[PDB]
Every structure is written in structure tokens, then in C-alpha cells.
Symmetry: C2
Subunit: 1105 residues, 2 copies
């Protein structure tokens, strides 16, 4: 079978946000068990006051994992954390998770708690189906398989205290037999329900002190804690970094025990350990450190340690170190095994054994400790060497043991390729994540394996991680570059520039790479016969080396071909290819229609044939005049050479007429500049004579012409002729034609798609300005080299980094020699460097959710059904109407009886309003109603403060007589004039009441105010408040009076429906009558008597100035 290694590791543990903080706590000796009240009030039900608790549970980067916000709230916190922990674990091994997608990688998760599901499924009237998908224990592994796209087994183990280690053992077995190429092993535990801790306390497992004093005489029990840890296991082949190899892992059950199920048996553990280390071939003397269970139980510790003594310490001279991580962080039941595994891996990586806290005196029943056979890790002990043993024993009797062989790869020997700079490319959800990755990579710039691992994982699509950055490491300069990546794919175009770019000593820096030197040497072998060695030309100090045209051509073509090879090494494939003057051959090689030997030979023969002519000198100068104007303006014997851009054109011809035209142009002020022509005219009639010999020589060199590609846009053939014979095949005829034909460079630029990325393949990015001016603004220009730069390798690496920042995927690793794997021991951890987007906080169950009262939330948001309350403004601030309390109490009573609101005629008595609740503009206020059926009393409360109280009960025998309108205070007001709605509410505004449209329900009211008409908008609160408004309208007293007590209110929906009548409009109204003698207000089917109104302060702050 294949070897199984622990490629990656990550996790959140008590008081530690990642593994680096966990190690800082372990080595630093800081106790990770806390006394705070984050989960539930300390000392509840007599529970221990101390336990290990994660720092935060309400964080999750939902958008990354494709979870809608509604499902995120209803998702189990264990799963929310485990998704992130698993992603961190995968990358921690240097493996981009995309590589594992579609494979048979398995997911085994050891979980022993479903507290979250219980809280979300407690209300059948509101629970949603999401809580089943998100919180079901079966989804702990199925969600990971779904997101990461694993086709292998997905199981969730439930054995207690061994679930995570048992999952690791199952994954080891699966990988060992070849069932899976890799596995994800996870263990999760979170403390949410105190009742489970109460069960454990009743069983006697928990410790009164809350301290898991393992191996000490005063061991009262263990103390619960929560942690999430995930480990990536892979075959030897796929592992980039190997924390340790799993020599053997086994499991067995204690079986029948006389004492009971919970009583541990040491003989079975001894048998398991002996069988494992016998089948694995490991001798007992090789072990150096044993990770005992060490829960501190008065019975479990002696049994386990005596089993270890009888199994391992029988015949080894040097003492066997024994330690337990539960004395540091506590006991996470299912995730206990993986916590110990993480501690062991961290200790091996850093070379020190984290000590055990709370160990002062050995347990007398353990003779091994007294005589020194077992040495406990009181202090940080440096790692010496040997195998490591990890065992976890569930309280049900299921044992799991593991044998590890720590990785001991020594740091690699120094090599020349370490001296030169390397490129680091980072990707992250937010700019801070990219900056963290870049800073950590820079801090370890000398580490080649770490940089390679970082570069491997940086390849993530811009949709998942929108922020990308790069930083050249070890260069003469260069700070990290960070910026967002625009969405969508972006075409990549190669632009190869022509003559005039070569400079003395160009390309020497780039040759310190291996690919460039290989291409240069291959070109040298190609053009060896003629005697021109490209390496000698490049290295030659003499300036005339590139003054000679032949050397210029050959070296330029060689450098362009080497650059193309370097670009193609990373996997970059162009979508378009444009050549300007020479470099059409190099463009051909980039396309593939020409082979390197053919390209170099064609360029050399091109150059040599140009020399043999010895034609009269011709100087070509760029002209600031446009193409059209200059071409007709050209003197005889001078024509437009290259159409670089609309603004500038280059013309070549006889030196005298060209110089006179250049001086004339300077006279007119148009841009004038004579580019280096080497004394020989280019792309003019002079090249016409050179045509025959060049074509014959090319045929001598080129014998098998091949078709051109669609990507290549020939700039020597007019676009109308692109279907011609020459444009079909890149044969010698095409090159000869391009030599004499004008260079229509600007013509083909228009075909570059919007958002194009343009790489200028050339020894010097001469045409960068031309590309800027003549290309679409969305396009990007990248030089890849520069003239007289201090180190062109740094410039090329910066160009590659900018290419990465533009959304294109190029891996710098391919350039430099491959790094030896697995990585050396001590390579910095990568999981702590992953930063997420945690701006949003998600719901988490509270202790009040689990078992051991109607609630109404008044929301004034426009979409909220209670938005009409915004219209009831008193004294400039919104107040909840008293009729609102009456209505919620009525609804609560109706629900208690089971009848609908409209079916329940209710009676209120002795209603008292103790305080006025003020509805905030933003948020909500929760009002709670409690009814006592026996005493016919109710009570409304807010934040534990009594607000309303009284008596409410069903009206057993309604009497329609009650709602008959009472005798008028005045029999004959006899006034045709009456107040309308506008006038009534003008008066009420003058008093101090500001009612909006929803609370302006009075259509009319008599001048004396006793009798009027009210609207009926299908809302009870508005109707009753309108009755109160009518009652107040008659008061002669000035000021703002608000209700304080109501003696009795009778409501009968049937007589309300009967009383209502319709006006000429379709609106419905109810006639109201107010009798101040009898203190009764009767309207429709509502009857209010004994209303008492008490003067409010009517003082508002920030009054108009």
C-alpha cells in the first residue's frame, strides 16, 4: 500500500483563533480555560465555573461558500467554522483545493453534539426547512463534500471522546488500501446547552474546580471545552509538506466490563498499543513521547498509565516522556484526539514539547511515575527524535491509537538559484488578507519551499477572491502591490517590436535563469555554422556588437524567442499576436508556424542579405504628421514606411530628401525625430532589390511552409488581402513581402478586444507609448524589459506580477528550478495566514433557547405591517398608542382561548398605563404579554419594566343595548356648522397632537365635540385611538393630555360589523357619541367608560430657534 502523511492542519481551539495562537498559548504556559460568561452565566445549576470556549462563533464568510444569508443564520456554528477550518487545512498543505475537486477524496468528521438543531426546531409554527439541511449531523461532512466537490465517502462518526481520532483512523485505512487519494479528518465540539454539562456533572465526570489536572494526585474529573480542528491526509505522492507519517492506526473496544460501561479498562488499551506497534514493525524502544488521554479522572489515569507502562516501558532504558494537552485547553469530547494531534505536530515543527499545566505531584497508584520510567513534560523539553504515540479513549469504551513518525527533512543546501530574486503572488478575500500573505512571505523571503507553496495556492479565480497582490522578493527594491481584480476574462496579446530596441549588454540579467539560457544556447546551436554566437554577442562589451545589423537581428530574434519560451513555460497562451516590422518571425514562432531554428536562420539570412546589397544609404525618421497628410506630403523617393499610429508615421528613403522633409516638418512644428536606421533604408523601394536573394535564401532555410493561425494578425498584408496566398502560409514569400511591404501596425490595433492585456515581447518596450495612444483605453500594457535597467530580471518579475494582478493566471514557479519535496521541517504554517471576510455576524443559539409569554416586536420599517404607527406622533416623538397595548392583549387572549380576534368579544377593566414606550426610528421594541386565566389579570412589560396592567376576560353574554348611543349632553345643538377632518386636526395640532394620515380617522365632529363620525380602515388600534381623540377634542383644558386609566372597555365585533354604514364613497364609517356627564364614549361596537387623562409635560427638546 501507499504511505499516509498529514499534509495540512488547521483549527480553532479554546482561546486561540488559529494554530499560531494555540502554539503561543501552549509554549507560553498560558492556561486556555476561562471563567467568563460568554456561553451561559457562570455557576448555573451548580456547574463548574471554568471551561474552554472559542473566542467567537458568530463569524462566517458566507459569500465565499455560496450560502444565502437566510441559510447562514440557520446553519450550525460547528459547520460554519468547519468549512473555513477545512479550507485553511487544505491550503496549509500547499495544495490548491481546485486540484482535489472531482477526486474521490473522503471526508470523515467526528461530531457528538446537535445542540444547534434542537434550538432551531423548537417552534413548529416558525421552524424552516433550512435548519434541517444546515444543522443535521449528517450534513457536517456532506456540506464539505458538496462545497469542495469530493466524490469519496462522507461519514459523520458519533463515538464519544474518540470521534475525531476514529475518523482519522478510518481515513488512514481508506487511503492505505488505495480507496482514496486524500482524506479530510475533522472533529468539532461547541458548548451551547447547559443541560448536557449538567448531565456530565451528575455522572461525576466533571471536576468541581473546572481544571483537568492530568497525572496529578488531585484529579476530580475533566472540564469541558470546545474546539474545531481539521486535518488533510494524503498519500505520499500528493503531499507538499509532511508534518508526520502515520505508521499504523488501530481501534478496539473494551467489551464487557465488570465495573460498568464508563469504567475504563487498561488491559484492552495495552493490547491495542502492543498490537499496533507490533504490526507496524516499530520496536517499543523507538518511542520518545506518548500523548496519553490524561483526562485527570481518579480511575482513568492510573488505568491508562499502567497500560502504557506494561506495553511500552517494559524494556526501554531511557524514560518515556508522557504528556497531555487537556491540562492546557480542557477536554473537547469528540475533537480531543485532533487537538492532541495538533499539539504534537506543533511541538515537532518547533522542536519543543509543550508542557503540562497543573501537574505538581504524581498519582501514587501510578508506580511508573514514582520510579521514573515515565517522565512528564513539566518544562519545555527539546525534541530528540523518535516515533510519537497518540491515543484517545472514549468514555463508552472505544479505543483509538496512532503511531507517528515525525518528519525530519533537513534544510536544503544553498544553491545559486537562491541568490536571484523570486516572485511572490498572493490572493485574498480582502486587502488585509493579501497584505498578510505578502508580508509573511517577505519575512521569510529566503525560504524557497515556503514561497513555492504560497505561489501554488495563489491561483484562485477573481470571482472567489477579488483582491490580488504581488511582491518581488530579494530584489534591489520593490514593495508589495495590492489591488482589486476586475471580474471577467481578459484576452492576452503578444506584441513583438521591431528594430531599434537592441542595446549593449541586453539580456545578460535574464540569462541567470535556466529557461532563457537554454533558449539562447539552442539559438546559438541553430546559427552556429555562420560563426555568430548569440551568447558572445550578448556578453560582448564592445558597443559595436549591436551596431552591426546582422548581430542586431540575430540577438533581437533570440531574445524575443527566449522571452516567448519563458512566457510559455508558465502556461500562458496568447489570444492574439501582432508584429511590428521585424519580429514577425518571432511572432511566427510564438504562433507556432515557425520553429526556433527556422526563425533564427530566417532572421540571420534576412540580415546578411541586407548587408551584401551595399545599397545607397537611407535614413528613416518618425514624423509627427498623420499618415494621410504625410503620405501625400512625402517628396519623390520618400514614402510612408510604418503606420505606427494616427499621430505619428515613420518614413524611410534617400538621406537628402528625407532630411530636407524633416527640416521642413520641424519648420511647421510637427513632431520630427530620426530613428536609428543604421544607414540602410527599411520598408522602401531599396529593399526591392534585396528581395530575390532573400527569398532564395529563405527557401533554402524554409522548406516546409505551414499555415498561419487565426490569432496572428499579419501587419505586412493589407486586411483586404488576408485571404490571399501569402497571408495563408508563413512561407519565405511572406517574410520577403513583409520586408518590403509597409508596416501597417496601427491598422491591426483596432482589432484588439476591449479589456485586452498586452505584453510587449521585446528587449526594450519601445512601442509602449504607441500602444498607449493607439489602443483601447481598457487595454493594459506590460513592458517585460527595459533599457539600461539595473536588473532586468526584477523588471520581468514585476511584469509577471502585474499580469497576475490583471486577472491572468501565470505561475512564477515554473521559471525557477523545482523545489525538492516534501518541504523541510520548520516551514512556516500557512493556515494562520488565511484571512476571511467577517464583517457580518450570524445568529447563534443562546442558553434561553433550550428548555429548563407572548412576544410582540413593534417594527416601524415601511415593509413592516405595523408601519402605520409612525403616523401617531405625540409632542414630536412617536409613542405606542394605548389602544396598541389593548389590541395586543386582545390578540393574546384570543390565541389563549383559540378563537380568532374578530370572534372574541372582550372586556377590559382597570387598565393602567404605568409608562409610555417610545418607538425608535431604527430597530424594534419587544413587548411581552403574560396572562393569568384564573385571576383574569394581564400584564404588558418591556425589558422587564411593567408598562400596562389591568384585567381582561371574554365577554360571555354580549348585550346590544350597551352600544346604543347614549342621551346627548345637549339635545339641540342646532348648528349647521361643524368641524371637518382638516379643522379637527388643525385644532389637535394646535393643542400638541401630530397625527398622520393613518390616525386621522375623524370625518367630522360637532362643534361641542360630543358627537361625530369616524372612519373604519379595518384597523382596531386606529379606530379606538380615534375614539380617544374625539373624547379629548371636547376638553376645554389646554395642553397635551394622554390616557392613564380606563375603568372598563367593552368590544363586540358583531355589533361593530352591524353598526358600520357606507357613505357615498366606498369608505366605511362608524357614528361616535361622547357623553361627558356619564363618562362614556360609544362608537360602533366599542364602548369606553371612565377614561382618565393626565397632563403630560408637553416639553420637547431642540425646539425651533
Amino acid at each position: 500500500p501507499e504511505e499516509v502523511v498529514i499534509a495540512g492542519m488547521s483549527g480553532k481551539l479554546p482561546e486561540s483563533e488559529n494554530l499560531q495562537e494555540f502554539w503561543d498559548n501552549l509554549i507560553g504556559g498560558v492556561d486556555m480555560v476561562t471563567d467568563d460568561d460568554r456561553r451561559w452565566k457562570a455557576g448555573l445549576y451548580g456547574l463548574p465555573r471554568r471551561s474552554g470556549k472559542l473566542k467567537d462563533l458568530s463569524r462566517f464568510d458566507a459569500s465565499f461558500f455560496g450560502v444565502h444569508p437566510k441559510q447562514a443564520h440557520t446553519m450550525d456554528p460547528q459547520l460554519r467554522l468547519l468549512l473555513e477550518v477545512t479550507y485553511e487545512a487544505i491550503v496549509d498543505g500547499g495544495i490548491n483545493p481546485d486540484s482535489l475537486r472531482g477526486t474521490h477524496t473522503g471526508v470523515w468528521v467526528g461530531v457528538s453534539g446537535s445542540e444547534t438543531s434542537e434550538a432551531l426546531s423548537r417552534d413548529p409554527e416558525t421552524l424552516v426547512g433550512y435548519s434541517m439541511v444546515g444543522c443535521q449531523r449528517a450534513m457536517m461532512a456532506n456540506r464539505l463534500s458538496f462545497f469542495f466537490d469530493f466524490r469519496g465517502p462522507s461519514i459523520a462518526l458519533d463515538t464519544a471522546c474518540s470521534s475525531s481520532l476514529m475518523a482519522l483512523q478510518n481515513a488512514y485505512q481508506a487511503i492505505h488500501s488505495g480507496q482514496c487519494p486524500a482524506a479530510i479528518v475533522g472533529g468539532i465540539n461547541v458548548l451551547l446547552k447547559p443541560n448536557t454539562s449538567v448531565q456530565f456533572l451528575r455522572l461525576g465526570m466533571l471536576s468541581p474546580e473546572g481544571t483537568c489536572k492530568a497525572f496529578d494526585t488531585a484529579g476530580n474529573g475533566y472540564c469541558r471545552s470546545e474546539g474545531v480542528v481539521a486535518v488533510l491526509l494524503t498519500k505520499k505522492s500528493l503531499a507538499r509538506r509532511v508534518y508526520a507519517t502515520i505508521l499504523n492506526a488501530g481501534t478496539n473496544t473494551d467489551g464487557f466490563k465488570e465495573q460498568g460501561v464508563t469504567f475504563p479498562s487498561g488491559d484492552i488499551q495495552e493490547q491495542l498499543i502492543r498490537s499496533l506497534y507490533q504490526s507496524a514493525g516499530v520496536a517499543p524502544e523507538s518511542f520518545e513521547y506518548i500523548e496519553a488521554h490524561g483526562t485527570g479522572t481518579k480511575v482513568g489515569d492510573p488505568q491508562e498509565l499502567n497500560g502504557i507502562t506494561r506495553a511500552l516501558c517494559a524494556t526501554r532504558q531511557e524514560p518515556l516522556l508522557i504528556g497531555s494537552t487537556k491540562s492546557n485547553m480542557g477536554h473537547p469530547e469528540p475533537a480531543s484526539g485532533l487537538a492532541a494531534l495538533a499539539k504534537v505536530l506543533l511541538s515537532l515543527e518547533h522542536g519543543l514539547w509543550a508542557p503540562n499545566l497543573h501537574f505538581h505531584s504524581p498519582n501514587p497508584e501510578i508506580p511508573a511515575l514514582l520510579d521514573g520510567r515515565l517522565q512528564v513534560v513539566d518544562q519545555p523539553l527539546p525534541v530528540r527524535g523518535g516515533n510519537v504515540g497518540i491515543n484517545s479513549f472514549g468514555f463508552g469504551g472505544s479505543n483509538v491509537h496512532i503511531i507517528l513518525r515525525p518528519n525530519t527533512q533537513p534544510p536544503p543546501a544553498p544553491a545559486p538559484h537562491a541568490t536571484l530574486p523570486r516572485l511572490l503572488r498572493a490572493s485574498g478575500r480582502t486587502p488585509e488578507a493579501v497584505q498578510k500573505l505578502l508580508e509573511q512571505g517577505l519575512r521569510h523571503s529566503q525560504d524557497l519551499a515556503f514561497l513555492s507553496m504560497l505561489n501554488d495556492i495563489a491561483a484562485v479565480p477573481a470571482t472567489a477572491m477579488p483582491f490580488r497582490g504581488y511582491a518581488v522578493l530579494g530584489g534591489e527594491r520593490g514593495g508589495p502591490e495590492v489591488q482589486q481584480v476586475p471580474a471577467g476574462e481578459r484576452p492576452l496579446w503578444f506584441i513583438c517590436s521591431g528594430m531599434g530596441t537592441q542595446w549593449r549588454g541586453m539580456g545578460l540579467s535574464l540569462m541567470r535563469l535556466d529557461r532563457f539560457r537554454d533558449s539562447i544556447l539552442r539559438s546559438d546551436e541553430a546559427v552556429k555554422p555562420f560563426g555568430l554566437k548569440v551568447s558572445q554577442l550578448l556578453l560582448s562589451t564592445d558597443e559595436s556588437t549591436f551596431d552591426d545589423i546582422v548581430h542586431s537581428f540575430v540577438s533581437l530574434t533570440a531574445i524575443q524567442i527566449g522571452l516567448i519560451d519563458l512566457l510559455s513555460c508558465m502556461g500562458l497562451r496568447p489570444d492574439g499576436i501582432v508584429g511590428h516590422s521585424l519580429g514577425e518571425v518571432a511572432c511566427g514562432y510564438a504562433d507556432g508556424c515557425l520553429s526556433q531554428e527556422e526563425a533564427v536562420l530566417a532572421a540571420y539570412w534576412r540580415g546578411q542579405c541586407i548587408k551584401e546589397a551595399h545599397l545607397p544609404p537611407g535614413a528613416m525618421a518618425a514624423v509627427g504628421l498623420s499618415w494621410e497628410e504625410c503620405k501625400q506630403r512625402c517628396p519623390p523617393g520618400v514614402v510612408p514606411a510604418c503606420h505606427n499610429s494616427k499621430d505619428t508615421v515613420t518614413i524611410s528613403g534617400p538621406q537628402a530628401p528625407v532630411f530636407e522633409f524633416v527640416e521642413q516638418l520641424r519648420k511647421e512644428g510637427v513632431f520630427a525625430k530620426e530613428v536609428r536606421t543604421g544607414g540602410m533604408a527599411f520598408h522602401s523601394y531599396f529593399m526591392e532589390a534585396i528581395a530575390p536573394p532573400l527569398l532564395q535564401e529563405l527557401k533554402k532555410v524554409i522548406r516546409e511552409p505551414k499555415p498561419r493561425s487565426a490569432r496572428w494578425l499579419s501587419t505586412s498584408i493589407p486586411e483586404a488581402q488576408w485571404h490571399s496566398s501569402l497571408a495563408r502560409t508563413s512561407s519565405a514569400e511572406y517574410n520577403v513581402n513583409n520586408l518590403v511591404s509597409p508596416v501597417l501596425f496601427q491598422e491591426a490595433l483596432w482589432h484588439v478586444p476591449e479589456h485586452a492585456v498586452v505584453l510587449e515581447i521585446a528587449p526594450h518596450a519601445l512601442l509602449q507609448a504607441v500602444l498607449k495612444r493607439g489602443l483601447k483605453p481598457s487595454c493594459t500594457i506590460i513592458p517585460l524589459m527595459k533599457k539600461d535597467h539595473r536588473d532586468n530580471l526584477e523588471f520581468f518579475l514585476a511584469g509577471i506580477g502585474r499580469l497576475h494582478l490583471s486577472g491572468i493566471d501565470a505561475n512564477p514557479n515554473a521559471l525557477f528550478p523545482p523545489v525538492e519535496f516534501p518541504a523541510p521541517r520548520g516551514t512556516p504554517l500557512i493556515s494562520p495566514l488565511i484571512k476571511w471576510d467577517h464583517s457580518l455576524a450570524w445568529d447563534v443559539p443562546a442558553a434561553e433557547d433550550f428548555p429548563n409569554a407572548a412576544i410582540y416586536n413593534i417594527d416601524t420599517s415601511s415593509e413592516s405591517p405595523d408601519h402605520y404607527l409612525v403616523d401617531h406622533t405625540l409632542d414630536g416623538r412617536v409613542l405606542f398608542p394605548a389602544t396598541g397595548y389593548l389590541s395586543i392583549v386582545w390578540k393574546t387572549l384570543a390565541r389563549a382561548l383559540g378563537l380568532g380576534v374578530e370572534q372574541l368579544p372582550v372586556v377590559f377593566e382597570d387598565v393602567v398605563l404605568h409608562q409610555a414606550t417610545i418607538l425608535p426610528k431604527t430597530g424594534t421594541v419587544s413587548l411581552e404579554v403574560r396572562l393569568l386565566e384564573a385571576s383574569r389579570a394581564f400584564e404588558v412589560s418591556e425589558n422587564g419594566n411593567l408598562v400596562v396592567s389591568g384585567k381582561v376576560y371574554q365577554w360571555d353574554d354580549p348585550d346590544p343595548r350597551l352600544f346604543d348611543h347614549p342621551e346627548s349632553p345637549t339635545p339641540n345643538p342646532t348648528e349647521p356648522l361643524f368641524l371637518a377632518q382638516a379643522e379637527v386636526y388643525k385644532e389637535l395640532r394646535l393643542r400638541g397632537y401630530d397625527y398622520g394620515p393613518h390616525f386621522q380617522g375623524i370625518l367630522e365632529a360637532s362643534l361641542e365635540g360630543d358627537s361625530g363620525r369616524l372612519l373604519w380602515k379595518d384597523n382596531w388600534v386606529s379606530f379606538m385611538d380615534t375614539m380617544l381623540q374625539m373624547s379629548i377634542l371636547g376638553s376645554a383644558k389646554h395642553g397635551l393630555y394622554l390616557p392613564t386609566r380606563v375603568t372598563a372597555i367593552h368590544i363586540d365585533p358583531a355589533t361593530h360589523r352591524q353598526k358600520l354604514y357606507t357613505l357615498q364613497d366606498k369608505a366605511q364609517v362608524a357614528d361616535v357619541v361622547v357623553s361627558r356627564w356619564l363618562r362614556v364614549t360609544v362608537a360602533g361596537g366599542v364602548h369606553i367608560s371612565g377614561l382618565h387623562t393626565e397632563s403630560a409635560p408637553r416639553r420637547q427638546q431642540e425646539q425651533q430657534v
Copy 2:
């Protein structure tokens, strides 16, 4: 060395018995915890092999049979 594999996806009895912290009993967990579905069988029948309880989302029985 016989092993026990049990595929169980429900723990409602433990939820019902542990609801009230004042009058709940300790040994309720030894009899209701999911892990004890296989551990109790191994205890009584005295099997020394693996004792695992799986959930695996509605295919628990056949997954246990495959294991």
C-alpha cells in the same frame, strides 16, 4: 474482535430526558447518547472490535453494512 456498526440519525430521547436540568439524571446519557447505541451492544455482547455509530444522511444502515 467482532465490530459493531450502527446507523442512527435520531437522538430525540436524549433531548426529552435532559430537558429539565433540575430533575434530570446522570445515567440518562449513558443510555441515550448516540455513541452508546453501538457501545452498549459491544459492552453486553463483549465484542472487542470497532464500535461506531454513523449518521451519513439517510443511508446510514447501508453505509454501516459497507463498512
